[PDB]
């Protein structure tokens, strides 16, 4: 009685475009074109697909199948699979928090640009502003200029001294105080996700119609726009020129694996939640297949969208697009790409749809990000919770604002990197490995093939079987070992992070991980019996 059976989605296309909305984000736009053109160019497509087929797709489809089959949250599903690994559901809840502290501040920057892009003369065109230094040298100014080590462009000056105000902080040590503009921007973001999540899957699923389709439109406008620019073939040459020798490096495969994993994002509980609210009779194999193939191809065309404008920018400057595309991160889109689109007709248009496109890219993904955690807590503490959804949703949203207050600082950008590199990647890889191993090895991949066989009507192929049993946990294990062995020294804006950052990072990387061995200790520590007896009753799910 009472609630009993769970709710169901409003249409097939909503959940298709919804999982597409989670899959597609900023990184699809600029991360993949950079990592592609840097690691052997077009040849990077060869391992990228392999790491997709053997790694990303199986985790994606396994996660999705479990989600639609068991209809449980990220915490409650472990109660009915492997209770000792229930802490996994908790770990994600912490991980997501760390992500929601920086991912939306980027959307706040794109939002600050968007509202600052309504003026007839764009701010980052002239140097006669209140934030530019004496180094600021700009165009529509005398030709022959010969750039100096200390000179700075109006776009770099605008991004550095205004929207970030990063010159007012010395690094991780001193980063305060808070830029209230980015606080209001990210507040508006938390509002626009508040009215798109608070109701549940119906609103996220309806806002997704806009948040997942518009990026293709803006990418299409900047695509046909960037294609008509003179000398844009340079960026395409640098973008797709095959350099097969780079394929001999054992690093490149690692980069491809990490890319496809962190662009499909399986085992994060978001796909579990998005899959939970669907029909048991409804097919999901085709769903997972098509959805991934969209995320990959969308990245492929996004490469052109970026490197066409970068090619035109390298033509107006002096070629070897790599030099104009050295820095990967927020500067490739907020400085180089913005300064590139500044010299184009009706620049207000392309600017508005560009930064609006950035916000539109982050919105759907963060919808899904929150959706997974919300589903997990509501399903884990029912009746004690579900009293209202706006209460718990409001709680997690304002929590994400207070979490971003460290990021809204002057040196917030610094923290963004520390959180983007150190915290998420190793832990997420770990929980994906433990999750995959627990579904494929503990629960038994045989019974999983029986669950899919009861789901779609047919048992999954021997390919999916061997991928889940061996190829996928080895796929995650690869990136785990390669990551731990060579953690990266990182620098941003002529500032090398202190030696101790990794320590801090490891804290932020493990402070979220402590819950699963301590929960195994809590489960095995709480029920008396013998060690062999209690772990045998704790590995087998509920019989009824």
């Amino acid at each position, epitope marked *: 009685g009472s609630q009993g059976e769970r709710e169901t989605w409003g249409k097939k296309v909503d959940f298709l475009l919804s999982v597409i909305g989670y899959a597609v984000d900023l990184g699809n736009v600029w991360r993949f074109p950079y990592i592609c053109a840097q690691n052997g160019g077009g040849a990077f497509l060869l391992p990228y697909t392999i790491m997709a087929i053997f790694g990303g797709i199986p985790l994606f489809y396994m996660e999705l199948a479990l989600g639609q089959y068991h209809r449980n949250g990220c915490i409650s599903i472990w109660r009915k699979i492997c209770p000792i690994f229930k802490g996994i559901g908790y770990a994600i809840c912490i991980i997501a928090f760390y992500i929601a502290s920086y991912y939306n501040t980027i959307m706040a920057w794109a939002l600050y640009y968007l509202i600052s892009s309504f003026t007839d003369q764009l701010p980052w065109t002239s140097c006669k502003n209140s934030w530019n230094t004496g180094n600021c040298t700009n165009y529509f100014s005398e030709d022959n200029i010969t*750039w*100096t*080590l*200390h000179s700075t462009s109006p776009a770099e000056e605008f991004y550095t001294r205004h929207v970030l105000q990063i010159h007012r902080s010395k690094g991780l040590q001193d980063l305060g105080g808070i830029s209230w503009q980015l606080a209001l921007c990210i507040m508006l973001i938390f509002t626009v996700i508040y009215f798109s999540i608070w109701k549940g899957v119906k609103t996220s699923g309806k806002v997704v119609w806009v948040t997942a389709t518009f990026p293709y439109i803006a990418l299409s406008v900047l695509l046909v726009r960037g294609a008509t620019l003179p000398g844009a073939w340079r960026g395409v040459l640098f973008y797709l020129k095959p350099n097969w020798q780079k394929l001999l490096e054992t690093g490149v495969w690692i980069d491809a694996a990490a890319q496809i994993f962190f662009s499909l994002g399986p085992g994060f509980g978001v796909l579990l939640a998005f899959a939970s609210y669907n029909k048991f009779n409804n097919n999901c194999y085709q769903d997972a297949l098509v959805t991934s193939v969209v995320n990959c191809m969308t990245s492929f065309v996004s490469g052109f969208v970026i490197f066409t404008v970068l090619g035109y920018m390298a033509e107006m400057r*002096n*070629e*070897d697009v*790599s*030099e104009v595309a050295k820095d990967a991160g927020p500067s490739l889109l907020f400085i180089t790409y913005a300064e590139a689109i500044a010299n184009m007709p009706a620049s207000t248009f392309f600017a508005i749809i560009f930064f609006l496109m950035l916000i539109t890219l982050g919105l759907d993904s963060t919808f899904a990000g929150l959706e997974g955690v919300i589903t997990a807590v509501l399903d884990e503490f029912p009746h004690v919770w579900a009293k209202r959804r706006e209460r718990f949703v409001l709680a997690v949203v304002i929590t994400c604002f207070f979490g971003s207050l460290v990021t809204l600082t002057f040196g917030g950008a610094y923290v963004v990197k520390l959180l983007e590199e150190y915290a998420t990647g190793p832990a997420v890889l770990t929980v994906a490995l433990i999750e995959a191993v627990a579904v494929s090895w503990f629960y038994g991949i045989t019974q999983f093939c029986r669950d899919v066989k009861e789901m779609l009507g047919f048992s999954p192929g021997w390919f999916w079987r061997i991928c889940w049993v061996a190829i996928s946990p080895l796929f995650l294990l690869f990136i785990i070992a390669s990551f731990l062995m060579s953690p990266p020294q990182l620098r941003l804006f002529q500032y090398n992070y202190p030696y101790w950052s990794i320590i801090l990072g490891y804290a932020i990387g493990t402070s979220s991980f402590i819950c699963i061995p301590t929960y195994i200790a809590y489960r095995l520590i709480i029920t008396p019996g013998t060690f062999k007896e209690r772990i045998i009753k704790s590995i087998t799910p509920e019989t009824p």
Partner: antibody
Framework: EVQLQQSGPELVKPGASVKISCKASGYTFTDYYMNWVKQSHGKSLEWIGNINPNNGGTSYNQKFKGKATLTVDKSSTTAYMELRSLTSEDSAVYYCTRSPVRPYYFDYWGQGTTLTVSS | DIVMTQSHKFMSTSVGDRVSITCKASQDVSTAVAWYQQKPGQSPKLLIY???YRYTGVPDRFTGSGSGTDFTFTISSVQAEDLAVYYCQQHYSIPRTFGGGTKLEIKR
């Protein structure tokens, strides 16, 4: 005006090391990349690498990686290039030349440094 | 990398004649070629940058042209002191490479 006074000629036995200086003057030293070009007897110019005087930002050539080591000192506005594993091919004239960051031309050069690697 | 090829190692000209040295690059360069003048016994002296622009302190008798891959250095009034070895160098892709060097010998 702008002057790049290099060091004198050096006669060094093969297998040893040798360091060449480059006193820069006449401009804001921190405003320009400091480059090193190799010129073999009867050969063309050969770009060794550059260095950012602010933080010692060395950007070498794959052909000279581990062959040359560029350093810089702001307290005296002087850039140095050290060479190890000296052979008969290194017996060439070396120049230190100033360059902006873009466009990357070599506006001012040094007088050259005659290096002879022989026992 | 980039291979700058000066097919003609030597070129003969006279005082007052119109001389032009060619320069072939590996790939498309747009307008990123600099011409240097190394007089016998002196350091290479920068004359042209970015294909056509002249550098400061260079007489009007030195000009540059070309757009794409092949570029040309022109001297209208050759003087007795214009006797030198001319190099061409690209400035777009890392690393920066040079030409083989064209010695300009004067005929009298």
């Amino acid at each position: 005006e702008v002057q790049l006074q290099q060091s004198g000629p050096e006669l060094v036995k093969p297998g040893a090391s040798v360091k060449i200086s480059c006193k820069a003057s006449g401009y804001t030293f921190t405003d320009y990349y400091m480059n090193w070009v190799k010129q073999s007897h009867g050969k063309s110019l050969e770009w060794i690498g550059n260095i950012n005087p602010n933080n010692g930002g060395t950007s070498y050539n794959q052909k000279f990686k581990g062959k040359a080591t560029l350093t810089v000192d702001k307290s005296s506005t002087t850039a140095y290039m050290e060479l190890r594993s000296l052979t008969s091919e290194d017996s060439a004239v070396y120049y230190c030349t100033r360059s902006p960051v873009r466009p990357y031309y070599f506006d001012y050069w040094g007088q050259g440094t005659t290096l002879t690697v022989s026992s | 990398d980039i291979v700058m090829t000066q097919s003609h190692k030597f070129m003969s000209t006279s005082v007052g004649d119109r001389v032009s040295i060619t320069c072939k690059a590996s790939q498309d360069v747009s307008t990123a070629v600099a011409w240097y003048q190394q007089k016998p016994g002196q350091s290479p002296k920068l004359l042209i940058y970015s294909a056509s622009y002249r550098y400061t302190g260079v007489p009007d008798r030195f000009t540059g042209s070309g757009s794409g891959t092949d570029f040309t250095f022109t001297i209208s009034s050759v003087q007795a002191e214009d006797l030198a070895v001319y190099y061409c160098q690209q400035h777009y892709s890392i690393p920066r490479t040079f030409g083989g060097g064209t010695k300009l010998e004067i005929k009298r």
